[PDB]
Design a protein around this ligand. Structure first.
Ligand SMILES: *[C@@H]1O[C@H](CO)[C@@H](O[C@@H]2O[C@H](CO)[C@@H](O[C@@H]3O[C@H](CO)[C@@H](O)[C@H](O)[C@@H]3O)[C@H](O)[C@H]2NC(C)=O)[C@H](O)[C@H]1NC(C)=O
Ligand SMILES: *[C@@H]1O[C@H](CO)[C@@H](O[C@@H]2O[C@H](CO)[C@@H](O[C@@H]3O[C@H](CO)[C@@H](O)[C@H](O)[C@@H]3O)[C@H](O)[C@H]2NC(C)=O)[C@H](O)[C@H]1NC(C)=O
Ligand SMILES: *[C@@H]1O[C@H](CO)[C@@H](O[C@@H]2O[C@H](CO)[C@@H](O[C@@H]3O[C@H](CO)[C@@H](O)[C@H](O)[C@@H]3O)[C@H](O)[C@H]2NC(C)=O)[C@H](O)[C@H]1NC(C)=O
Ligand SMILES: *[C@@H]1O[C@H](CO)[C@@H](O)[C@H](O)[C@H]1NC(C)=O
Ligand SMILES: *[C@@H]1O[C@H](CO)[C@@H](O)[C@H](O)[C@H]1NC(C)=O
Ligand SMILES: *[C@@H]1O[C@H](CO)[C@@H](O)[C@H](O)[C@H]1NC(C)=O
Ligand SMILES: *[C@@H]1O[C@H](CO)[C@@H](O)[C@H](O)[C@H]1NC(C)=O
Ligand SMILES: *[C@@H]1O[C@H](CO)[C@@H](O)[C@H](O)[C@H]1NC(C)=O
Ligand SMILES: *[C@@H]1O[C@H](CO)[C@@H](O)[C@H](O)[C@H]1NC(C)=O
Lengths: 162, 325, 325, 162, 325, 162
């Protein structure tokens, strides 16, 4: 991934976070847990759903081959028909296969970017008050209970306290 | 106390390809291509297809005596012609503009058989002896096409000028057939039509036809060295057809009121079974039941089908790279 | 003291679509598609189109007496044929290879009418009585095509062999017409051409023609049960045409020196008004005046037109996401 | 946006900066004002102008449908002509509509990246000497007059002073 | 102590274009298009092409006496016809369905010439005097096509009905030719075939032919005002051909056992030299020797060629932006 | 470049680093030298080789024009053949030229991203222990011999030492 987060500085995924694409693992006195970031997950779901549907809609025409026959004295127009039908078959096979390879690459980059930005949103809030361990984890210099955790996730962390 | 940022992993082994990398396991993905068919023919728009069974298109539409099963009115969503159908043009000869006829019939939806020229149309000729052992029915060993009549000479008085007329006063075009006989020698000619230069002439407001017998011995086919030149045309609403001949006329007897289709039209050459089922998408090699966007089953279909493509797979990534730990 | 980094916003409500998101407001954008036409025909390359008005292509080029307005030399950037033009083939019959003729004429730019065979070409026949009430002019009620001559028999001496010759010694190909008459019965035949087997034969260095009258009563059209088989060909530079006939010949009188176009060529079937204006791009449904890359007006045009496409809109983002506050 | 700046950590645009796409808002003793960064704005204008023109040039061919007629006994070649003309119409409609959706997405990302990099260029110059407020603004720890401001914008800010 | 992160630069001046920027120098890149040809014809699959030299396709396959170099069996990977070849149809006339014949022959790989009807096939006619000064050989000034025989009348007894038959009992289709003579006047007709209505009739299990002479003076070509209507057909395995005529028959003498190609087939109209070399890819304007994906040399080729494209260049970046310092 | 490293905050390339695409320049008591980062270089080589080969494979069909002739009375089907052959020539010329312009842009971004991430990998390891000069160089606050240098490059730099 060109953004460097997925299978990058965050080496692996979380099979434990089952309720979304991107999110958090917190650990404090009340214990541990996974939680999806629903805003960035839902935004990605909408974008990718839109992309799938747009591809499906642009591909919703069909070239129609026909059953028509040609006599032994119509070799030229019979072959013209074959070469044309094959002609369109090749451009649409090309269009579909190339599009999928291109879209797949960009889709993975999209997810990679979103994890990166999520990581940046958190680093930007905490600043001095946490230690960035280099792997997507932050160690707080102060006690962070459940409302503190939740204010980091909803993007309203209150730095001047603590 | 700590908070970590991370991403979803799961038990997926489903893979996609990208420009940069092959065989990438992703958490979620969707396949856009269908490679699955039901190997059979079904109804389309809840209308049944027409099975020709042991008759070819020509045998069906000419009224080959062994195609009586098909004889009459038909409605079809599409036509299925069996590869080994034996009942076509029984009396040897060429159906002219055969490929255009097939295309015409393929663009249709329904035919209504009706009597266009009763045998009593043709004054002073015999209409009851025009049979041949090249055209057996399932009972008689010498019959003839149900839609044509082989006119021969009476007692021995000379083949008079015969005449027929039909004004198409209906709303539908009429598909009809006729022929010109070409005996192998001049005595067979004389025995059937008498002496003199013979002609077959035909005309509408927009069509002209004129031909003479071309007497010659051709290689034997179904026991005949003679030939028939079969023809077809379409009489449009408001048009009128005049027939004039003094011999060698295979006359139009029955014809077809033709309903052209609003849809596409298909003629499938296949061995596949026709069954009692519905479908929205029917290809020549089977039924597709999908919501998918592409298919690699067949370029040839009737109904609402996905785009045909040569690809084995078109799997789109939706989720992210699967990195479980 | 502070410095901030930021980006432009404005009052734009113009939106674009992306793969990820519909209806995104952007600060700047450009529309690539034209959906606007001027519903009229104009000059192309400052050359005017040819309006056929109440004449069809066949009536114009055969010299139908009611098309005298068009008669003679013409130059055109394209041709406009009106859907309800009544003046075509007045004496019933088929123009052979009609679709190829239209394609030929469409590839052209200019015709020069000239006399190819003066009536005095044909020795021992009448050239002054070949008229018909099926071809009225605007004055006479019985006339005939200005480019053909219906040759009939004189006093009553037998229809001799007539002969004509033209060596094309110019630099341009020649478009010319001729016909074969087919009377309804054998007495009309005799009254006009006398007895005996009749023929019409024609040949150049590269073309052969030969046909006989086919006597038969066809349904009446414009009061005639007879027919004419109209033909056309092109005499190439250096080629020579020989005509030989002993009856039933509708002879070539006037013909056309033909200038083929370097450009494309169009024949528009339309009702749209022709006006006094210029254009670089003319479609069948109107003029486009644009610099834009695509258009959804028509696939059919002459001139320098944008790519035809079925899209309502093709708006490209140039500026950024509009987030005013 | 995958880079996270436009409608991201910089929440909104500036209707007050009318003279360019990306730029600055400064505030010191001499007052306040907007100024476009002309280097990054012009570079983007050139790139996007090039992209528009390249698309226009690649689309500067036309498939030409024709007026040709076909008799009732030329149903096969008439239909061959129709299916071919429709065939090309569908691939070009596909090409144009897909290209625009793809290019639009990447164009917005381009602008998003450029704002991000502009923000990075400034953060990199100031270092210790300013406080990053998390929204694209920097509060100086020292007085920054108009020449100081202008040296930040022209990328020659002199850290060892002040 | 310091560590720096950086990237490769080199001495490259090779440039690529991108959507955002033209003429970008990159460290590494690959060109995908070939613009280079060897201006010659070579072997394909180590099989040689057939050079027609001074003969056209018609002259070769009809057996024009000045094409004896080519006469007999041939095997070819493709055919080269020279633009200025003078030896085609020497006795004036039209080869019917000429374009279909060329397409047929183009789909082939090998012909075997064999005698199909020995001259002794035709009872009661002369087979030794059918020559013409329009068809000189390189020795005789009056010869005729090696594959046809111009049958004329003997002593003066009347042109009897002649008959020939060939059952194709082999595994390969047979390409054969025949003609109908059209004299300029009725005395030349009488001098060669005698009086009476003449015909040429021909038939197989699937083909019918019938034509009469059409007597008329056409413009002189190679010193002849007469004409021949040349025809061709293909006799399929298992089929039999019957010939019947009483005059004006240019008879089939020799024919060709035809091997259809599994590959593509090409007929190149070119002046390029044929040389002693191998190739996998041969275009009409030269040989391509490449591994590249595209080419802008020619859309017309035989062999395994790269995709034809109108581009001057298709250089793909692989390395990065070259910024040396 | 949208990631801002190549001809960005790292102003130029290194003609001295001949053995790879991305890498390092170190300077300590034992002297100076260039070394490629083989992991990120090889990963890029594989990706780009895959991209080239995928393009080559999708373009490995050919539309086949034919030699067939048409008489003077076959102007319509002759022109149908011409317009179709030209039709496919135009879509494939379009496909190839557009693809190359698009792929070239994204390829340069790829390299640009990889240099950026390489720079981030190093900054993340060093933290306090080096001074980021803003141009891709880090000045160590401690002596860094050859094994220290090599541990930065192989991503196992040991912060708690020194
Ligand atoms: C983001 O998360 C933070 C932390 O969960 C949210 O702040 C919390 O807001 C609730 C009320 O919405 C506060 O509870 C209140 O406490 C008083 C007693 O002091 C009680 O009388 C009220 O009825 C209510 O229960 C809670 O203290 C506060 N947590 C803090 C300040 O740490 C914040 O609302 C969230 N924002 C969004 C946009 O979701
Ligand atoms: C980037 O912006 C800075 C700040 O505006 C530019 O530095 C400034 O350069 C001017 C001259 O070009 C300096 O003014 C000079 O002052 C002396 C008196 O000390 C006077 O004798 C000269 O005639 C001239 O007016 C100005 O002091 C200086 N500002 C500083 C150092 O803060 C810099 O040139 C700009 N660079 C680029 C590439 O645009
Ligand atoms: C990444 O680079 C570092 C630094 O080059 C590598 O650490 C080094 O590992 C070697 C052994 O693999 C250590 O040498 C050993 O020293 C002891 C004596 O103390 C000797 O008995 C052993 O035989 C061996 O020579 C070397 O000290 C150590 N450098 C340090 C710790 O600074 C590290 O292995 C590299 N990792 C990877 C994955 O490449
Ligand atoms: C790689 O992909 C091919 C087909 O795309 C598949 O047959 C093969 O098993 C895959 N290999 C791995 C290791 O996934
Ligand atoms: C039948 O055709 C004739 C034309 O010959 C026409 O005059 C007549 O009105 C038609 N009859 C009907 C019932 O339409
Ligand atoms: C969304 O787009 C459609 C057409 O693309 C338009 O009709 C509709 O008004 C748009 N909605 C909004 C909220 O912009
Ligand atoms: C006209 O044609 C004849 C061929 O029959 C030719 O010999 C003669 O030279 C031609 N005349 C002119 C003036 O070109
Ligand atoms: C820019 O490119 C064109 C062709 O693409 C070339 O002729 C010209 O020399 C190039 N200019 C520079 C400065 O590289
Ligand atoms: C030749 O053809 C006849 C058909 O007329 C057939 O009966 C005969 O068996 C054939 N001969 C051979 C040797 O195939």
């Amino acid at each position: 991934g060109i953004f460097g987060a997925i299978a990058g500085f965050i080496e692996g995924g979380w099979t434990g976070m089952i309720d979304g694409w991107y999110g958090y693992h917190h650990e404090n006195s009340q214990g541990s847990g996974y939680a999806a970031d629903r805003e960035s997950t839902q935004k990605a779901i909408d974008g990718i759903t839109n992309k799938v549907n747009s591809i499906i809609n642009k591909m919703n025409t069909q070239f129609e081959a026909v059953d028509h026959e040609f006599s032994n004295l119509e070799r030229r127009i019979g072959n013209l028909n074959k070469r044309m039908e094959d002609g369109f078959l090749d451009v649409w096979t090309y269009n579909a296969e190339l599009l999928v390879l291109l879209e797949n690459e960009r889709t993975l980059d999209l997810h990679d970017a979103n994890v990166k930005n999520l990581y940046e949103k958190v680093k930007s809030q905490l600043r001095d008050n946490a230690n960035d361990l280099g792997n997507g984890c932050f160690e707080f210099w102060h006690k962070c209970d459940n409302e503190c955790m939740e204010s980091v996730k909803n993007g309203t962390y209150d730095y001047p306290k603590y | 106390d700590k908070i970590c940022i991370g991403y979803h992993a799961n038990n997926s082994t489903t893979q996609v390809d990208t420009l940069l990398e092959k065989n990438v396991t992703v958490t979620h993905s969707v396949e856009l291509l269908e490679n699955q068919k039901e190997k059979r023919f079904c109804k389309i728009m809840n209308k049944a297809p027409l099975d020709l069974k042991d008759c070819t298109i020509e045998g069906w539409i000419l009224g080959n005596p062994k195609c009586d099963l098909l004889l009459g009115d038909q409605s079809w969503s599409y036509i299925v012609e069996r590869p080994n159908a034996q009942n076509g043009i029984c009396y040897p000869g060429v159906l002219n503009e055969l490929e255009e006829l097939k295309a015409f019939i393929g663009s249709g939806e329904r035919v209504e058989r009706f009597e266009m020229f009763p045998k009593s149309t043709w004054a002073g000729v015999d209409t009851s002896r025009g049979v041949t052992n090249a055209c057996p029915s399932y009972t008689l060993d010498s019959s003839f096409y149900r839609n044509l009549v082989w006119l021969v000479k009476t007692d021995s008085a000379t083949y008079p000028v015969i005449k027929g007329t039909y004004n198409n006063t209906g709303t539908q075009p009429i598909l009809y057939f006729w022929g010109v006989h070409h005996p192998l020698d001049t005595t067979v000619q004389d025995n059937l039509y008498g002496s003199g230069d013979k002609y077959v002439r035909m005309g509408t407001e927009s069509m002209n036809f004129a031909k003479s017998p071309e007497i010659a011995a051709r290689p034997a086919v179904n026991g005949q060295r003679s030939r028939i030149d079969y023809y077809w045309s379409v009489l449009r609403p408001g048009e009128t057809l005049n027939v004039e001949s003094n011999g060698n006329l295979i006359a139009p007897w029955y014809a077809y009121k033709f309903v052209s289709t609003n849809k596409k039209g298909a003629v499938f050459k296949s061995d596949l079974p026709i069954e009692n089922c519905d479908a929205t998408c029917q290809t020549i090699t089977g039924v597709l039941r999908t919501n998918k966007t592409f298919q690699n089953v067949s370029p040839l279909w009737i109904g609402e089908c996905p785009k045909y493509v040569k690809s084995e797979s078109l799997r789109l990534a939706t989720g992210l790279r699967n990195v479980p730990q």
